[PDB]
Paper text:
In contrast, spirochetal flagellar filaments are comprised of a flagellin homolog ([name]) and FlaA, a second and completely unrelated component. Our structures reveal that a conserved [name] core assembly is enclosed by an asymmetric assembly of sheath proteins with novel folds and functions.
The resulting averaged map achieved an overall (average) resolution of ~10 Å and exhibits a series of concentric protein layers centered around a ~ 2 nm central pore, as well as a distinct array of globular features decorating the filament surface. Sheath densities were mainly localized on the outer curvature of the filament, or ‘convex’ side, thus offsetting the filament center of mass away from the central pore when the filament is viewed in cross section. The asymmetric localization of [name] and [name], specifically on the convex side of the sheath, is distinct from previously characterized exoflagella but is consistent with prior flagellum electron-microscopic imaging studies performed with antibody labels. Following 11-fold averaging, improved resolution in the core region allowed for straightforward fitting of a core atomic model representing a single 52 Å repeat of [name] (11 subunits), which we obtained by applying estimated pseudo-helical symmetry parameters to a [name] monomer homology model (backbone-only atoms) derived from the reported flagellin atomic structure. [name] molecules project both arms toward the core region, positioning the long arm within contact radius of two predicted loop regions in [name]. Modeled [name] subunits project their central β-sheets radially away from the core and present several elements within contact radius of the [name] inner sheath layer, including one of the long [name] α-helices (α4) as well as several loops located at the proximal edge of the β-sheet. The modeled [name] sites are too far away from the core to make direct contact, providing an explanation for why deletion of [name] leads to concurrent loss of [name] from the filament.
Numbering used by the authors:
A (entry chain BA): 61 to 219
B (entry chain BI): 1 to 32, 37 to 76, 90 to 160, 177 to 187, 192 to 221
C (entry chain BB): 220 to 272
D (entry chain BB), F (entry chain BV), I (entry chain BM): 8 to 60
E (entry chain BE): 55 to 291
G (entry chain BL): 114 to 219
H (entry chain AG): 61 to 113
J (entry chain BZ): 174 to 232
């Protein structure tokens, strides 16, 4: 049964990862868009068109984190490091007691500096940051989530 | 022993007195509901032990409050009979208390047992007098025969006020206040 | 099109879950079968001898 | 009295039969009697797989 | 204030102290007074009931010492595989469940002793003895520690029959914490019905009992027809 | 008990499966589970390739 | 790596047989030199002794590296850190071989 | 006879269970249909067809 | 009684058959029984394709 | 954090109102300097509602 | 105190170069300043031109 628990854990961990692959491709797409946006002759009106694409991609991230469930457990939203209870992903790996592991993880749009909008006239109330930091921020976003995926990857190999 | 019994009776006499002093305040409802509660305004009538609802509920000459309590059927009734007329002023926020001449209560459902009998009717004919007014409380017993609380052995007399009468006085002061606060 | 990639990854992983939760390794269940079948035969034979007693 | 061999024989006949139940469907769990919780979870997983598709 | 309000303030503070989470000074004070009951009572079954209660409280006190020592020993480990946020939370989740589960075992051992204390009090059959302040105060202390042991582990439904037995004893009904805990435990049960989509009869039963003990706790601490009472009056309507 | 061969059989089926994961994408690294850092770096290189274009 | 090493400490602690701890440091001596005595022949003085122990402190337990850490350790000379892992493998491989050889004796 | 009663009980219980397997196959099918139904561009007329099922 | 395998065998023979119905036509939907609404819509789309041409 | 002060006797304190005003003022000015003028309106409006800020000419 | 201040300074610089957390930046900066000032006090004396200088730079 411990072997089974180990294997059921492997898939849970992979499920989480699939949502994070989704999450990273999003950052990579936003990064592509940020580079276009960082072009100072690319206009504010055209930037609003980009922000349509980016804003929804940001919302999609928050939705992935919110609804990414396995066996009705939410594996990505901020129920880590604690929700109503700290109860999280314990896997019981050996046949005896004290042969145990816990896994925790969290992402939402507030995983990185969640930049929306851009200088100029908008219909929102938000603007993007220093283009250099916006690039750095998206590297930070990618770094933070890819690093979280690395956690799951390595964890899978342990199992 | 009898010492504890004596102290218990005293606490219960004062408990029914303090609530009767609050019940005499519900005069404020004559110039004026919580769930399952129905209030009628009226006058003492018939043989003087029952309250007759007014055709004119808002009338300034009503001197009795009749309150019915329902639950899941009629469970309880109280009739507050007041001494003295109401203030001429139509605003209930200005109205003052009137010592009760009588309190008549009925239990229909959720009946309490005193030595295995139900006292379905309680008639208090001196609610704002000396707290020790057991001789003024008539008990109508079902297994309804008339007994006087002061002639009840004592535990028995204590159980009557502890289990039946104080609680009903408090329940109705609670409901009359609930109605008042909603409309005040 | 992005969303489909995300959904497809979750899909494959969820199907891996179903297989690992329900689908047995036939090799080991076959080993169990053989052990149990032998014990059935051994049982029957000794009742034949127990009858002799 | 029949020696314990009658116990073994019945039990091993049952283990062989149970092995068939599992092997034919390919699953550790064919029934709630094998594992009620593994079953309930895989039923949830199936609605997740199909809903997702 | 009035003479009764000044008296009431004093009494509420004494009642809050009475329900104070156990510690070593309270332990000593408690067993001074519970033994004072053994002094007058001179009853072997009461003595046995107290001996078992004291063993139960000792289980609780020894557990509190264990929890500090365990957390200390964990804090003093070098955590070189803790470079992730999740790994720090992981090790936290290890601590909390081991501590909570160990407290759960201590709770059962304490309640087995409290159950034995009650079973010995059950053997005092003479009604002239069962009505003794010595009998009632010990029974009250056994129930209070029992209520608290369950309360600490969030076992609130389990506290209801014991709180109800508690308030029936020697004016315990006039204790503000007893009504506060009853109201909170009833509130939990009401919320359970709302979350599990249970029957309406139980929803209203639990809501009603919550409001009764909410109102009574308010009355006892602040006085009837105080700004604080009057507030609860209108909400309960 | 099943001899060590049951280990080999499961593991080799897994090595065959892993070989397919890599081969179809053309890559040593398909997942972080093959190499989390080789992956993260190639993701950076890809943003550099596209940004550069 | 760190989790893998922590797993080693757990293996050493949790590696039980008939409730015996077979890897923690009760070997090659405790308060007495008595160890895993096996009685091989039918008579007295027909006996064998087995010793073994491992824990993370089996090798030079190097974790972490200069820069940002949440740990309290850093790695040493890279070449020696590599040599250390050979030492780790050597010490355990020999212990396994000792058991292997012992099995063949049995 | 007590052993027989135990076994006759097994048949009662298994009969009941089979009808509940049927019942769960139904729930899983209704859930599949509910997910389709929850699609806000899946029309009311088409929902009536689902409601037939 | 024949164990559940007689259920599996019949059902799997049917799933194999259904798989062929889809595969040879190239379609998720061959019949209304696969998806009555997907079918009705494609029939409308076909009149739109031909009418448009 | 100011939102977590729920007691109406505390929210009506001159201590509460002045800080909330200074937080809004710096917020308004930070946006104003970068020409983010539409964004300043809801904060200016919340500002003038507090403790006679409506009588301030710059607001 | 000179060695403590220098070693803490190194650690502060590591956080600045590796772009580490602010809590560690300030922790290391704080400890550098405590031991910088204490070394100054010990060698030159309290309220010496050198003490007064380091205090004014840190505050």
């Amino acid at each position: 049964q411990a072997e089974r628990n180990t294997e059921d854990g492997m898939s849970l961990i992979q499920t989480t990862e699939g949502f994070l692959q989704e999450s990273n491709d999003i950052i990579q797409r936003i990064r592509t868009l940020a580079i276009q946006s960082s072009n100072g002759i690319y206009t504010e009106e055209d930037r609003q068109m980009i922000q349509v694409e980016v804003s929804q991609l940001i919302d999609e991230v928050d939705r992935i984190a919110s609804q990414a469930e396995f066996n009705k457990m939410n594996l990505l939203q901020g129920d880590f490091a604690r929700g109503s209870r700290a109860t999280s992903m314990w896997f019981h790996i050996g046949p005896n007691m004290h042969q145990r592991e816990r896994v925790f993880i969290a992402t939402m749009t507030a995983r990185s500096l969640n930049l929306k909008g851009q200088s100029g006239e908008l219909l929102s109330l938000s603007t993007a940051d220093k283009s250099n930091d916006a690039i750095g921020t998206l590297d930070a976003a990618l770094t933070r989530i890819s690093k979280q995926r690395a956690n799951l990857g390595a964890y899978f190999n342990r199992l | 022993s009898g010492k504890s019994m004596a102290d218990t009776e005293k606490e219960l006499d004062d408990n029914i007195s303090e609530v009767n002093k609050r019940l005499r305040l519900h005069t404020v409802l004559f110039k004026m509901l919580p769930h399952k509660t129905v209030l009628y305004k009226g006058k003492p009538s018939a043989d003087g032990e029952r309250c007759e609802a007014a055709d004119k509920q808002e009338a300034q000459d009503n001197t009795c409050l009749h309150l019915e309590v329902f639950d899941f059927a009629k469970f309880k009734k109280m009739e507050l009979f007041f001494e003295g007329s109401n203030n001429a002023d139509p605003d209930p926020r200005k109205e003052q208390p009137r010592n009760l001449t009588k309190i008549r209560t009925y239990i229909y459902q959720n009946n309490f047992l005193l030595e295995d009998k139900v006292i379905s009717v309680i008639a208090d004919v001196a609610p704002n007098g000396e707290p020790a007014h057991n001789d003024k409380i008539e008990l109508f017993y079902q297994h309804v025969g008339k007994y006087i609380l002061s002639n009840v052995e004592n535990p028995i007399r204590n159980n009557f006020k502890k289990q039946f009468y104080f609680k009903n006085l408090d329940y109705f002061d609670k409901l009359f206040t609930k109605i008042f606060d909603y409309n005040d | 099109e992005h969303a489909a990639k995300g959904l497809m990854n979750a899909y494959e992983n969820t199907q891996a879950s179903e297989s690992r939760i329900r689908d047995a390794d036939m090799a080991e269940e076959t080993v169990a079968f053989t052990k149990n079948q032998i014990l059935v035969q051994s049982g029957t034979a000794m009742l034949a001898q127990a009858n002799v007693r | 009295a029949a020696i314990n061999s009658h116990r073994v024989l019945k039990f091993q006949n049952e283990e062989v039969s149970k092995n068939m139940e599992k092997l034919s469907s390919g699953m550790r769990i064919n029934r709630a009697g094998d594992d009620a919780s593994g079953l309930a979870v895989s039923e949830k997983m199936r609605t997740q797989v199909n809903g997702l598709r | 204030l009035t003479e009764d309000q000044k008296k009431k303030k004093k009494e509420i503070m004494e009642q809050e102290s009475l329900w104070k989470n156990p510690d070593f000074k309270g332990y000593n004070k408690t067993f001074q007074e519970l033994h004072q009951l053994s002094k007058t009572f001179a009853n072997n079954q009461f003595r046995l009931a107290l001996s078992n209660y004291q063993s139960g409280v000792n289980t609780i006190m020894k557990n509190r010492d264990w929890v500090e020592q365990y957390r200390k020993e964990e804090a003093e480990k070098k955590r070189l595989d803790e470079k992730w946020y999740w790994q720090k939370v992981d090790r936290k989740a290890r601590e909390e469940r081991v501590v909570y589960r160990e407290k759960m075992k201590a709770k059962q051992d304490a309640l087995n002793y409290f159950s034995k204390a009650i079973n010995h009090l059950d053997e005092i059959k003479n009604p002239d003895l069962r009505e003794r302040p010595e009998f009632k105060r010990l029974l009250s202390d056994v129930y209070r520690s029992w209520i608290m042991a369950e309360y600490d582990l969030q076992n609130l439904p389990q506290t209801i029959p014991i709180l109800e037995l508690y308030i029936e004893i020697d004016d315990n009904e006039k204790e503000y914490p007893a009504h506060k805990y009853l109201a909170s435990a009833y509130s939990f049960e009401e919320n359970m019905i709302k979350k599990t989509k249970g029957p309406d009869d139980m929803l209203f039963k639990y809501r009603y009992k919550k409001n009764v003990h909410l109102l009574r706790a308010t009355e006892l601490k602040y006085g009837k027809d105080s700004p604080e009472y009057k507030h609860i009056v209108n909400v309960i309507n």
